[PDB]
Amino acid sequence: KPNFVGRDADGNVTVDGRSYPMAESVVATESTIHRSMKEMAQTLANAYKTLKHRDTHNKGNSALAPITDENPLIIISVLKGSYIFTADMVRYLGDCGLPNVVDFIRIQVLDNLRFTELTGKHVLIMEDIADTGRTMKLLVEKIRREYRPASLKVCVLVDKPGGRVVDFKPEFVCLTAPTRYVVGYGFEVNDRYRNYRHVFVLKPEYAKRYPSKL
Amino acid sequence: PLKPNFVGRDADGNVTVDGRSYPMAESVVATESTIHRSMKEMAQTLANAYKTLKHRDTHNKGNSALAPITDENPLIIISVLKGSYIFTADMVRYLGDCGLPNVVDFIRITVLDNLRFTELTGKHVLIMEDIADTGRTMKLLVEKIRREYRPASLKVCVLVDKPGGRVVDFKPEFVCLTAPTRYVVGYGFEVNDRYRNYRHVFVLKPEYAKRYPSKL
Numbered sequence: 001k002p003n004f005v006g007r008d009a010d011g012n013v014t015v016d017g018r019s020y021p022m023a024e025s026v027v028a029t030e031s032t033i034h035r036s037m038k039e040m041a042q043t044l045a046n047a048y049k050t051l052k053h054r055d056t057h058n059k060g061n062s063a064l065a066p067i068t069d070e071n072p073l074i075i076i077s078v079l080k081g082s083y084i085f086t087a088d089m090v091r092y093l094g095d096c097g098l099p100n101v102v103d104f105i106r107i108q109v110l111d112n113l114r115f116t117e118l119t120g121k122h123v124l125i126m127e128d129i130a131d132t133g134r135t136m137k138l139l140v141e142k143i144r145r146e147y148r149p150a151s152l153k154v155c156v157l158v159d160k161p162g163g164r165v166v167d168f169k170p171e172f173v174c175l176t177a178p179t180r181y182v183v184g185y186g187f188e189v190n191d192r193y194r195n196y197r198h199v200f201v202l203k204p205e206y207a208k209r210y211p212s213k214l
Numbered sequence: 215p216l217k218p219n220f221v222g223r224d225a226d227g228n229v230t231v232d233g234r235s236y237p238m239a240e241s242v243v244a245t246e247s248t249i250h251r252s253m254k255e256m257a258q259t260l261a262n263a264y265k266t267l268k269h270r271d272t273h274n275k276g277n278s279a280l281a282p283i284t285d286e287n288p289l290i291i292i293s294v295l296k297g298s299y300i301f302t303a304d305m306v307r308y309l310g311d312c313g314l315p316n317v318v319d320f321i322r323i324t325v326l327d328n329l330r331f332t333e334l335t336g337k338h339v340l341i342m343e344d345i346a347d348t349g350r351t352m353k354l355l356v357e358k359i360r361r362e363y364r365p366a367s368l369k370v371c372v373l374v375d376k377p378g379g380r381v382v383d384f385k386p387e388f389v390c391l392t393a394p395t396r397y398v399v400g401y402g403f404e405v406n407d408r409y410r411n412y413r414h415v416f417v418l419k420p421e422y423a424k425r426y427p428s429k430l
């Protein structure tokens with residue numbers, strides 16, 4: 001399970017024998033990424049499994065209902081960067097027995113949510129990264145104003161505390177990284193390297209490597 | 215994921231996989247290790263099919279010759295939301311193991327959310343879908359992509375094929391698993407979004423089909 005990190009004949013970063021010429025260094029290997037996400041899953045389960053919110057399964061019941069398959073935790077995943085993080089995370093949530101459903105928002109909102117009944121529900125946002133915090137600050141503001149959830153929290157895979165310049169603080173953080181551009185496991189440069197299993201610091205000379213439009 | 219899973223039954227007669235009870239399941243179509251074995255082999259099948267192909271160079275618009283599939287001009291993967299995102303997340307990582315450079319864009323059809331990629335003409339495009347049942351949705355999807363963009367090639371990779379349910383004539387080029395003509399749940403498949411995050415694919419109990427009628 002542990003991934004071997006080294007260097008090849010050239011100066012290139014290697015992980016399990018495969019060379020990553022775009023990488024300056026490794027932020028976290030896949031085994032490290034999944035271990036923290038498994039622990040975050042237990043953290044999320046402990047924080048939500050006993051909570052109660054509005055019963056929309058049985059609308060004739062005025063009492064708050066526990067988090068079950070009938071009234072699951074609402075997870076909002078931020079495309080495109082969070083879909084791999086989200087796919088792994090909700091599987092670990094199932095391992096911890098926390099019922100949840102996922103809808104996607106794409107961000108300026110490009111693709112709106114299709115879920116409509118978030119009022120008085122516990123809602124969790126799954127985002128790939130929090131750097132300056134501007135994106136998630138406005139997203140949290142918009143969801144609070146338009147949907148009025150019972151609670152609204154944010155779970156990020158990577159937090160860059162050194163970059164925060166607005167009043168935003170994610171409740172749940174898997175990994176903490178420096179203020180460098182990272183790629184891999186959802187992170188990309190013009191959509192490249194998104195499917196890599198590890199998170200790397202990108203070489204600065206690769207930052208403008210693909211200027212052409214997709 | 216590739217660890218052997220034990221299928222059993224608890225004292226209540228409910229399906230269990232690795233000791234975990236699944237009251238909504240009538241039977242098991244494929245456990246997680248079966249799922250991931252077929253995906254890894256399918257990724258090698260995908261890599262062998264696309265590795266040596268060439269398509270139009272959009273990285274360098276000054277170039278006139280066709281270009282190989284590289285980071286500069288990767289394979290274009292269109293993932294169909296919502297059912298395909300878990301399948302897609304695992305698949306593109308297996309494709310990286312095989313060294314097939316690819317980029318993913320999402321489309322949501324009933325079209326509710328359109329592609330943001332705009333340079334698909336003369337490109338090799340692979341649609342990644344959860345399941346092909348009656349085939350009407352994929353048939354209309356393939357025809358829409360062909361007419362609007364005219365890619366160099368357009369093929370469909372589905373996690374599950376239900377060939378016994380065909381209404382129209384549609385054959386996905388790549389099929390990881392086949393299922394009986396039943397309603398399936400788990401690993402992307404759901405009833406009103408429930409059970410999507412399960413690691414195995416089960417046949418749903420008919421009594422669970424209408425279990426969650428309320429709008430999310």
Ligand SMILES: O=c1[nH]c(=O)c2[nH+]cn([C@@H]3O[C@H](COP(=O)(O)O)[C@@H](O)[C@H]3O)c2[nH]1
Pocket residue numbers: 081129130131132133134135136180181182183187188189
């Ligand atoms: O590949 C990447 N490596 C990074 O280090 C990084 N930091 C920020 N982002 C992207 O910028 C968007 C805005 O994030 P903030 O509003 O929190 O600053 C984020 O939503 C991200 O999409 C990154 N993408």
Ligand SMILES: O=c1[nH]c(=O)c2[nH+]cn([C@@H]3O[C@H](COP(=O)(O)O)[C@@H](O)[C@H]3O)c2[nH]1
Pocket residue numbers: 297344345346347348349350351352396397398399403404405
């Ligand atoms: O949970 C599910 N279990 C199933 O057996 C099933 N069969 C079809 N579908 C869904 O129907 C949509 C259209 O597929 P077809 O046009 O091929 O029938 C597909 O895209 C699927 O979303 C299923 N969903």
Ligand SMILES: [Mg+2]
Pocket residue numbers: 069238
């Ligand atoms: Mg249930």
Ligand SMILES: [Mg+2]
Pocket residue numbers: 294295296297298343344345
């Ligand atoms: Mg579908």
